[PDB]
Write a protein that binds this DNA or RNA. Structure first.
Length: 61
DNA sequence: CGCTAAGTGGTT
DNA sequence: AACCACTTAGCG
């Protein structure tokens, strides 16, 4: 079974985008800290970072 | 549809 | 274990 697609809250997307604008990569500890602060799993944040770096490369052209 | 979350297969 | 490059697929 695929895992169900996460629907991020406004709060979670806002903080994820702010984190990404500051740092394109996070250390393990920063990734875990951000996940905890946003009530997300480590994997949800890791996955969001990774997909966000894909978008960042597309838009940098 | 537009945007993007999760899965695959491979690289680092 | 995390990333990459791409693929599959859900939801506003």
């Amino acid at each position: 079974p695929r895992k169900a697609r996460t629907a991020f809250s406004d709060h979670q997307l806002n903080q994820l985008e702010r984190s990404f604008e500051r740092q394109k990569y996070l250390s393990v500890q920063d990734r875990m800290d951000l996940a905890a602060a946003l009530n997300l799993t480590d994997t949800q944040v890791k996955t969001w970072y990774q997909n966000r770096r894909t978008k960042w490369k597309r838009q940098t052209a």
